[PDB]
Amino acid sequence: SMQLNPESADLRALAKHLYDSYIKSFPLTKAKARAILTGKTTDKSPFVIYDMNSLMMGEDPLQEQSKEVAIRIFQGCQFRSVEAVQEITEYAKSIPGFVNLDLNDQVTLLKYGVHEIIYTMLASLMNKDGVLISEGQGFMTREFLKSLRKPFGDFMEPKFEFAVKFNALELDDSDLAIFIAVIILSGDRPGLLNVKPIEDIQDNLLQALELQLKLNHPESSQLFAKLLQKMTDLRQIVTEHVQLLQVIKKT
Amino acid sequence: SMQLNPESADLRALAKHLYDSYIKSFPLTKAKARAILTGKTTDKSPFVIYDMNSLMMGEDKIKFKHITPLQEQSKEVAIRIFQGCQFRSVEAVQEITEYAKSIPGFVNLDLNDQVTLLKYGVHEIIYTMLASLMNKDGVLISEGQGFMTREFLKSLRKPFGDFMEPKFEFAVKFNALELDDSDLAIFIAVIILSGDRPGLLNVKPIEDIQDNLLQALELQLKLNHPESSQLFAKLLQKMTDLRQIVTEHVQLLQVIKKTETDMSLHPLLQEIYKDLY
Numbered sequence: 167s168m169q170l171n172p173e174s175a176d177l178r179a180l181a182k183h184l185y186d187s188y189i190k191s192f193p194l195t196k197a198k199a200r201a202i203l204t205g206k207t208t209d210k211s212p213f214v215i216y217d218m219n220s221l222m223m224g225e226d227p228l229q230e231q232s233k234e235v236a237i238r239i240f241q242g243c244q245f246r247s248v249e250a251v252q253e254i255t256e257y258a259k260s261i262p263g264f265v266n267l268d269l270n271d272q273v274t275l276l277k278y279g280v281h282e283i284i285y286t287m288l289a290s291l292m293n294k295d296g297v298l299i300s301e302g303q304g305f306m307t308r309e310f311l312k313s314l315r316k317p318f319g320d321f322m323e324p325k326f327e328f329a330v331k332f333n334a335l336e337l338d339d340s341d342l343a344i345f346i347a348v349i350i351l352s353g354d355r356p357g358l359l360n361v362k363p364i365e366d367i368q369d370n371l372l373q374a375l376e377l378q379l380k381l382n383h384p385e386s387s388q389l390f391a392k393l394l395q396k397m398t399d400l401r402q403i404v405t406e407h408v409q410l411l412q413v414i415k416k417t
Numbered sequence: 418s419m420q421l422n423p424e425s426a427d428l429r430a431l432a433k434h435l436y437d438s439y440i441k442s443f444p445l446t447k448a449k450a451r452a453i454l455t456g457k458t459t460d461k462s463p464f465v466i467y468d469m470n471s472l473m474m475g476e477d478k479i480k481f482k483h484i485t486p487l488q489e490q491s492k493e494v495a496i497r498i499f500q501g502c503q504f505r506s507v508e509a510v511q512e513i514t515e516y517a518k519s520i521p522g523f524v525n526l527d528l529n530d531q532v533t534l535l536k537y538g539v540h541e542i543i544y545t546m547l548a549s550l551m552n553k554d555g556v557l558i559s560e561g562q563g564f565m566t567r568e569f570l571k572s573l574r575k576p577f578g579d580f581m582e583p584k585f586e587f588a589v590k591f592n593a594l595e596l597d598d599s600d601l602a603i604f605i606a607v608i609i610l611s612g613d614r615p616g617l618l619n620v621k622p623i624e625d626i627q628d629n630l631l632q633a634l635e636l637q638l639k640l641n642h643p644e645s646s647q648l649f650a651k652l653l654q655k656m657t658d659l660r661q662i663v664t665e666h667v668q669l670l671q672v673i674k675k676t677e678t679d680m681s682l683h684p685l686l687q688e689i690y691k692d693l694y
């Protein structure tokens with residue numbers, strides 16, 4: 167049980183702040199994405215890329231223009247990944263305390279954070295069938311991405327695997343805003359000078375998260391613990407990504 | 418706020434069960450170790466290894482239990498000490514396996530899954546419990562009979578000098594949570610019953626057991642640490658640290674593996690050198 171007091175009020179105020187910021191930083195929210203994936207909004211009718219024929223109809227710089235469909239698609243992911251770092255960096259700047267940190271720690275926390283957030287928010291854009299691309303204008307199937315020649319055909323599978331289990335938590339934009347902020351303010355990132363001040367902020371964010379998950383998910387056993395376990399999955403996934411980016415890099 | 422009801426009583430019964438199993442499987446508890454490290458018990462007065470002189474007096478006055486067989490008997494102090502760690506690691510697996518067998522549900526699982534969970538879990542439990550034996554200054558060895566300093570371990574020739582540092586780094590942050598044996602019994606049982614281990618067939622039944630254990634843990638941490646912010650969350654975050662720590666251990670065991678005949682032939686070569694030149 168809880169009480170409505172000044173402490174619980176400030177954690178609600180903190181949660182509202184992060185959501186309004188999330189909304190300003192992230193154009194394609196989970197609510198928007200779920201609406202497109204379930205046919206509800208007329209606004210977007212994404213083109214479905216499910217095979218080589220629809221990939222060609224689908225597209226419709228100069229010296230990285232490759233014949234190999236696998237190359238063009240991996241360059242799409244790379245461009246959107248740079249865009250996603252901008253959005254996350256904008257979000258990060260609205261987390262109370264975060265700019266009052268050593269400019270050094272700031273770039274550190276972001277350096278290891280972005281890949282964890284990308285994967286977290288990639289789940290928002292995914293169902294069983296595939297993933298929204300180009301702000302909900304395109305939809306690329308899981309199986310088409312699997313069909314790409316090795317090792318590109320193995321690139322997104324682990325992301326799909328993550329998303330199925332993560333989307334079963336049934337988190338909304340309010341849940342995700344606080345979760346994403348908890349990820350960024352991670353004490354245990356290599357090379358940080360001032361750890362305590364990052365930790366004191368995360369303790370507040372973890373409190374805000376616990377309060378948000380209790381209020382927002384009345385029918386949910388250990389959703390806080392199941393969410394914090396996911397931060398372990400995400401580390402493992404980044405490791406597997408990096409190892410694959412460095413097999414692709416080599417050949 | 419909570420209620421004392423049948424559900425909360427089953428969770429306290431489950432915690433009591435795990436503690437009494439932990440006391441049975443783990444001869445040197447944190448409570449015993451803290452008592453040695455603070456000088457309270459006269460029972461153990463550990464011999465302190467802090468330099469090559471005390472290491473030599475150390476092997477003869479500690480009866481390590483771990484008798485290194487005749488033909489892996491190295492001159493290189495670094496070799497003998499790593500072989501010490503290796504023998505105590507095998508011993509630690511026996512103790513964890515025994516503990517594992519008492520976690521309700523754990524034996525009702527595919528014998529395959531049982532071996533999987535233990536296969537990845539022992540490395541995480543070893544680090545967890547090594548913290549129990551550590552302070553700022555070093556680590557208890559041979560069931561509290563010795564104490565080897567952090568700095569003496571760092572002083573050993575590369576790469577052996579880098580072997581325990583990460584364990585000290587982890588222990589410092591983990592020991593600041595101030596967990597006791599009750600807390601650790603449930604935390605260790607949570608780690609073993611991890612759904613996400615490569616190669617498990619039946620995930621759900623492991624997940625169902627772990628959800629009960631995470632409930633028992635939350636209740637134990639609330640009742641046992643009244644003055645502690647988000648201790649449950651901070652404990653779960655440690656379970657992420659341990660993955661990264663094990664990855665670093667394993668990579669170092671495989672740099673040692675590659676160069677193991679090469680490093681214990683430096684002494685006999687050092688003799689041939691000063692004999693010739």
Ligand SMILES: Cc1cccc(Nc2cc(Cl)nc(SCC(=O)O)n2)c1C
Nearest residue numbers: 239242243246247250284287288299300
């Ligand atoms: C153009 C294109 C082709 C194939 C896949 C994807 N999606 C990706 C891939 C990666 Cl690695 N990262 C992202 S960022 C997801 C988001 O936060 O919107 N989006 C995109 C956007």
Ligand SMILES: Cc1cccc(Nc2cc(Cl)nc(SCC(=O)O)n2)c1C
Nearest residue numbers: 498501502505506509543546547558559
């Ligand atoms: C000879 C020596 C030197 C340094 C450390 C240790 N002890 C270790 C080493 C390792 Cl890798 N693992 C353990 S398990 C800790 C426990 O519960 O006793 N104990 C030992 C036995």
